[PDB]
Design a protein around this ligand. Sequence first.
Ligand SMILES: COc1ccc([C@@H]2CC(=O)c3c(O)cc(O)cc3O2)cc1O
Ligand SMILES: COc1ccc([C@@H]2CC(=O)c3c(O)cc(O)cc3O2)cc1O
Ligand SMILES: COc1ccc([C@@H]2CC(=O)c3c(O)cc(O)cc3O2)cc1O
Lengths: 204, 202
Amino acid sequence: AESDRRFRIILSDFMALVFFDKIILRLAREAPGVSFELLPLDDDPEELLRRGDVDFLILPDLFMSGAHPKARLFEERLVCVGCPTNEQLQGQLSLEQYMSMGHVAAKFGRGLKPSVEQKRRIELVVPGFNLIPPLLSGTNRIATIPLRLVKHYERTIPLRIIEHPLPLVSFTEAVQWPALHNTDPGNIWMREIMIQEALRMESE
Amino acid sequence: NPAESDRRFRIILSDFMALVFFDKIILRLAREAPGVSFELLPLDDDPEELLRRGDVDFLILPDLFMSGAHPKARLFEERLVCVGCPTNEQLQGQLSLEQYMSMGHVAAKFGRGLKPSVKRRIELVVPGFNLIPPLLSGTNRIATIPLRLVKHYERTIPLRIIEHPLPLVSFTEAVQWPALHNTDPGNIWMREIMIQEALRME
Ligand SMILES: COc1ccc([C@@H]2CC(=O)c3c(O)cc(O)cc3O2)cc1O
Ligand SMILES: COc1ccc([C@@H]2CC(=O)c3c(O)cc(O)cc3O2)cc1O
Ligand SMILES: COc1ccc([C@@H]2CC(=O)c3c(O)cc(O)cc3O2)cc1O
């Protein structure tokens, strides 16, 4: 906790904003010499996990392979959202109506792996999750995104949750580390801190 | 009539330009061209290869970072300010260049880090500009970012702008299109709309 180690983490802009922010906050107190490079999700993360060029990979666990140690962070529900200004979004929407509307969707980098949800007519593609609410605001487009993201934006961008009529989908966000680092003291320390925070979040 | 087209435009730009500028484009064309669609592409590898193959319609970037092989147009002037957290104690007052070089710094790296931003101890590197205010809030780290970005987060994330002490630095955001598309009617239509919106942003 008195180190000057630089950790490298691969994660979504969503996970950076809604979760890792807690880590940076806490450690700015508990370990003020520890630094971070947050890397964008784009290429197979495995290549970097096998070589040990990254300390951590945060991803929903369905997208990880079984060749590195991983740990459950928390459950994330996927909801369908729209702009309060949208008329059709007033009332209940039929799965048929969903597939009849214009969609905003996130494509991470070169789109190696697919969005947990994805056919819909996508009229807006963006490099992450976080730009989706602002670029959706004021149009008749809908999107499907983490429920923790909609809450982060509650006081900033009002969003109408319309998923109530469609399938209930939830994934479990998780953290993975290289097996070559399973006994690194820095790695176990950061690991345990991340899991602590994720449990706090599971309570919410 | 391109206002009734179903063309999909591909644009390369920063999360900053997506959030403070292209949003206006998407907003306006939602009523003026309800079928035109967009794929916003992240800044990563040399955009010159996508421009020389006409694989995208537009690249939005500060003009110092563009080459002279493709036609481009001035969008607007963007000031670069130094920001910190109101809760930072040593940010109450003025910050010397030496003092600045003695503090922790949050910075943006785009993709593989092929291009530098416009001797600092960078304690946090993040893949764009937009995550910088949130990840900075509540720490003693500072950053340098477009002043239009600070104004966007003014009501959500309070930030302290440090201005008087360090140098005044501003660049010019611009738009570029492939030379092979200089005549494309669709390209000119979107291009000119983009220019109109930039002028309203002084
Ligand atoms: C290697 O390329 C990829 C890996 C993982 C993803 C998934 C894709 C995805 O749906 C996703 C998510 O819903 C939440 C999250 O925190 C991170 C996510 O990333 C996309 C990619 O393009
Ligand atoms: C998956 O992790 C991330 C993905 C994208 C970002 C932002 C996300 C984003 O929207 C973006 C963009 O439009 C242009 C660009 O050049 C870089 C961008 O990166 C931050 C992340 O942490
Ligand atoms: C293809 O590689 C790159 C191209 C341009 C950049 C610049 C880097 C940069 O400083 C910059 C900016 O100040 C404003 C903006 O809107 C977009 C910017 O992107 C970074 C890259 O990694």
